Ligand binder design. Structure first.
Ligand code: MG
Ligand code: MG
Ligand code: MG
Ligand code: MG
Ligand code: MG
Ligand code: MG
Ligand code: MG
Ligand code: MG
Ligand code: MG
Ligand code: MG
Ligand code: MG
Ligand code: MG
Ligand code: MG
Ligand code: MG
Ligand code: MG
Ligand code: MG
Ligand code: MG
Ligand code: MG
Ligand code: MG
Ligand code: MG
Ligand code: MG
Ligand code: MG
Ligand code: MG
Ligand code: MG
Ligand code: MG
Ligand code: MG
Ligand code: MG
Ligand code: MG
Ligand code: MG
Ligand code: MG
Ligand code: MG
Ligand code: MG
Ligand code: MG
Ligand code: MG
Ligand code: MG
Ligand code: MG
Length: 152
RNA sequence: GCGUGAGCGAAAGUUUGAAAAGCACUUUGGAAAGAGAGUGACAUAGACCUGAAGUCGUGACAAUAAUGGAAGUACCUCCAUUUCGCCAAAACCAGCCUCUACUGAGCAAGAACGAGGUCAUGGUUUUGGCGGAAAUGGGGUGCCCCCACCCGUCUUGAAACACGGACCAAG
RNA sequence: GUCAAAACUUAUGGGCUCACGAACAAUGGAUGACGCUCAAGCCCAAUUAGUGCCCAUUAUUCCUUUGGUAAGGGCGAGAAAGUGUAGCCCUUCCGAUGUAGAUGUGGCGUGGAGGUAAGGACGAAGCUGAUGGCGUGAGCCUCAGAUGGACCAGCCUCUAGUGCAGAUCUUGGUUGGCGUAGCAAAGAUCUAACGGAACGUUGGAUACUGGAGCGGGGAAGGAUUUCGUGCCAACGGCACUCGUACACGAGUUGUUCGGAUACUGAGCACAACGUUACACCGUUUUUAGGAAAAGGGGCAACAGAGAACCUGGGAUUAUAUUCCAAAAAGAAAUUGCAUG
RNA sequence: ACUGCAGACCGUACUCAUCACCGCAUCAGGUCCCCAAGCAUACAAUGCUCUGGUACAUAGAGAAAGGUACACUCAGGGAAGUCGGC
RNA sequence: ACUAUCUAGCGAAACGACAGUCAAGGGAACGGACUUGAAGGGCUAAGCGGGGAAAGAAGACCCUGUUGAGUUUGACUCCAGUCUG
RNA sequence: CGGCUCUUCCUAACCUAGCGGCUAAGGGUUGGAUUGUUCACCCACUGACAGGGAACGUGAGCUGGGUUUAGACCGUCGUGAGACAGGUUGGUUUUACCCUACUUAGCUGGAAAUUGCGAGAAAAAAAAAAUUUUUUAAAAUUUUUUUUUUUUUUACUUGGUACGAAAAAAA
RNA sequence: AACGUGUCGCGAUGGAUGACUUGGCUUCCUAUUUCGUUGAAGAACGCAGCAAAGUGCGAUAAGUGGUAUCAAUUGCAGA
RNA sequence: CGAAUCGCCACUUCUCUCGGCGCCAAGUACCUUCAUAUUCACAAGA
RNA sequence: GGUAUCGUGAGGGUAGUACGAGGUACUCCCAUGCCGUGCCUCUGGUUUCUGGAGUUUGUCGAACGGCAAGUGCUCCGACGCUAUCGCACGGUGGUUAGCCAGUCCCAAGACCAGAUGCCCA
RNA sequence: CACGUCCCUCUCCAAACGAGAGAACAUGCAUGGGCUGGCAUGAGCGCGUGGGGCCCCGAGGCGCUGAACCUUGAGGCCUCAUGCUGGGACU
């Protein structure tokens, strides 16, 4: 299961989505933004990044990705606005505020403590390239898991 | 499965567990799924023994061509051993090392006295320092100074602007 | 002189030198660099001065190893008559590089076997390892697994499908490049309403195809793609609520359509006969008695020849020149037999 | 003439194509036949239009350089370009 | 006008020893690794095409091999066919 | 091969410049006809139409005329297939999205060049104005007085800021 | 700082390894052992209450009959 | 926050061709504290 | 320590050139070419302001208004972009034409104890 | 948390994207007007080839009519007139 056990089981909510069918590299970016954030400011960052009001700071999986001015917030020039990945993150954060609520915990004091998008087993599909070749297409679905303690 | 055809022709261990007891029920989700709960000795045994490498994610940590060698040192050591002996320093002995004669003032020239050095030399302890820790060793990470042309290859000659060389596993 | 160890730029040495000087034409730039000029240059000599120092895998010496088919001694725990081990012990001496290659090895390690000895559910193998320890080394051993779940190490002997970074090696997996290159051919969608968890549906708008059509039927080919309901996990290189996808259930109706029954054609080939080591060949009639009640049998055209049917339907989710029911919606033609 | 009975077999869905066939594919390639409107026009050229069909070809924002084009325009000169009016 | 550019979705390939600033030098005789100098904070985005003797394919050139195949022939050795007896 | 394109470097200097052949690499060194060309030769201009290097600079820049495989023609050679550095004609020019260079374009660190606390300033060495002298809170922490700024009731380009006033707050 | 690098702890991807092995390979043997026009081998199509494949079978169709054997088959159902 | 460093100064701290002092009594008189910090060991002190 | 502003300028780049005429055989003039740095008033070019007009075929029943012809086509056409096809400009000092410095261009990884504004929980 | 920076938003002397310049309740944006330009005389009604039986049909023409329209938008002018008017991030 979780790479890191929550410090205080009763005070934290865990959530996860295995074989999430969003790009790993985009979801890798999208979930890492959240890793220290309070859940409401993380619900927010996504609602705002879903509006093209703010960007997810792509960091590791930059590549020749385009420069944006909304990335200044994050300390670098490159940034990006996944939607499929931002929605899955909200949809996994709903999962935990639900998990957090049942524990009697208060979702709006709750803080993201551990986000970890592992890359999942990949799905094959086929190209059909120039001179009779057939190279791979492969989605790179991510395993995202997280928990969110609220402070004591 | 492939080929008009003659023909070619795979991969695949359902090896979960003793048994299916194969996760009822609650909870969020449109769902997939998730969080609890439950079964079982174990579910990081969940349709699955083991569970490597490589690769990746994450946390913490040290940090600032690569690798590499040598030697230290900084920090860390889930390591070893030892001590309730370890680090030192001085001495003694041994070893070892260093530091007249002739000639017409010179040499082609010989020892002596004295003193010093030293254990990465041998034997003799002494004296202090340290003693949940200390101590020596190993390991790890960084640095420092220094050394250091990618390997395999055929070739007189390879660092070659010569060939082969992305990674790992099995063979 | 610095880099660079050493003349912290030594000489209480000689000369020489002003501009260069320090063994084997074109990217800017090379006494190695700087810089040096009573030199840090050159010739000469020197070593503290008329009273040296620095650096080797070298030498010497010391320690250790290894080898010697080298020289001796010996036989608190040990003392083995020994090539070789954890070497029987001690002493002394000499050697040590090395490609191709040769050889040694009580050398390492693997699967298996004959033995021996032992271990394991108080956890075997395997795997993990700032687990140390041992060994020159191949490696072994221990520790720890918050690893595993049932086998198995030692030792001597036997055996081999026995040791892998490299073969543009094989096979599997993974990777950087990289969220990149792209997904830019055929002009196009817009709107509201509804649906839905969130692209479809309808209306409107707008274009397009432009009758050699993103039209309506067929052949070949395909063979369920058809249709409806559902579905959208996967696939539909974006998305889908939709699909030629998935699942389930349906669906193709003939006296007359086409085909065969029933033509011949380019052709083919059974039979027979012949040839061939052999029929899996050839002629296509057979030296041949082919009639069963002059030239054997057959096949070969879904575009040739042949060929009795038309419409209407309020008849389907899907078929109709095929379905319709007694007023056959009906109207025909046609074949066979039979009937007045 | 009539009437009576009988009239058997197999095909039959769908496709026929920038997604149903062949091309490893829903591949800009290929693949026989038939029907085929109106206007301009000499017309089956071309353009456009009723019918029948489409709106499927991933989309968005904006409009660096360099490109592609079944896109143009260019003063004065007029082949001097180039191997060659390509 | 479509690309490119930036975005949402989706998403390869080639290539890949390792890398990757230069000048001189030497050197397998044109270094990214070596010697000596000179630079160089790191990471980026779009271009670009100089270099990486960039990639492509065990040079189609050439030579070698007691290797092939095609063709030729009054090469050697033959074999059908033909004709003659 | 050549050209084109672009840059660059050299000089046994063509022009220009200075001299009196010398120095001088600065900047410049033309457009055309023929031919693939280079080269040469021509025409015209020009101050002049200099010579070279840069992998005989420069094909993932192009072009593909030369060279140019297969097709074919001719001459010669060959018995022939075929040969000819003889002629003729026709004859796919692939890939950057890597690294560096470069070109623009951003971001961020950094002075023990990320550390040490490892400490160096092109600084000054009671203050200001005319080295010395004079002026700038006082009196018993709080109170009073003075000065400056903000708000309210002429000179600046001319709307809005300054000095005027008066009051309040701060030093 | 960031990225990137590196160590460690977890986790994912991956499927090695080890154990397993109703399989293969090889050797050997045995016998009342050798198809078919009495329709063979092969091919086709079918048959189960739910059955695609595989197996079994052949419109008597996962079987009829004889024999032995026994109380099952077993996914569900069914006797 | 434990650190390494171990002379100062307006007598050098101008120029152009034995600086002073400090080193254990603020002084040359040894008045006078020093131990066990037990013979080196970062000076245990600035 | 932030943030902001004005600057410094080590270092690097670096460019002007040629011809002619006049004037008197230097100075001094005056044009031009090339180069370079810009700019777009004018002039030219460019139009997807499809601006306005005209116009062809199809089309909207017709006029109007359109619309389609992948911008239908023709004329004019602003903005803008741009042209030696327009226009403006191209500076010194010091040393031995060179060369260096400057002007000119980038300029603190040249880490600027330069200045400055604001806040420094 | 201060000051403030940034994003979102608006503008463009900027611009591939970042960056830039600005704005930050502002004639800022929006329409409208006026202007400057462009084109070139709209719709609509009210001399003429001939033609048809005083009118009708008539391309073209005339008049209202330098009209009509367009004129800032990748971003002409005018305040002329009316209209509409902060959140987030960070330290
Ligand atoms: Mg790009
Ligand atoms: Mg980009
Ligand atoms: Mg193909
Ligand atoms: Mg497992
Ligand atoms: Mg050789
Ligand atoms: Mg030295
Ligand atoms: Mg040896
Ligand atoms: Mg074996
Ligand atoms: Mg390790
Ligand atoms: Mg083997
Ligand atoms: Mg892209
Ligand atoms: Mg049309
Ligand atoms: Mg359907
Ligand atoms: Mg199906
Ligand atoms: Mg015939
Ligand atoms: Mg027939
Ligand atoms: Mg027919
Ligand atoms: Mg028929
Ligand atoms: Mg139908
Ligand atoms: Mg049909
Ligand atoms: Mg058709
Ligand atoms: Mg037509
Ligand atoms: Mg046509
Ligand atoms: Mg022209
Ligand atoms: Mg010409
Ligand atoms: Mg010419
Ligand atoms: Mg020419
Ligand atoms: Mg070869
Ligand atoms: Mg030979
Ligand atoms: Mg042979
Ligand atoms: Mg060349
Ligand atoms: Mg090149
Ligand atoms: Mg610092
Ligand atoms: Mg079956
Ligand atoms: Mg101390
Ligand atoms: Mg505006």
């Amino acid at each position: 299961h979780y790479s890191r056990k929550p410090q205080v089981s009763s005070k934290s909510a865990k959530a996860k989505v295995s074989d999430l069918r969003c790009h790993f590299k985009n979801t890798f970016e999208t979930a890492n933004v959240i890793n220290g954030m309070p859940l409401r400011k993380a619900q927010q960052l996504y609602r705002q990044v879903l509006a093209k009001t703010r960007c997810i700071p792509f960091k590791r999986y930059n590549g020749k990705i385009g420069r944006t001015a909304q990335a200044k917030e994050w300390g670098q020039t490159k940034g990006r606005w996944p939607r499929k990945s931002v929605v899955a993150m909200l949809s996994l954060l709903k999962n935990a505020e639900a998990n957090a609520i049942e524990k009697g915990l208060d979702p709006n004091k709750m803080v993201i403590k551990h986000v970890q998008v592992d890359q999942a087993a990949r799905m094959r599909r086929r190209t059909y390239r120039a001179h009779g070749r057939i190279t791979p297409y492969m989605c790179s679905p991510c395993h995202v898991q997280l928990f969110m303690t609220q402070p004591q």
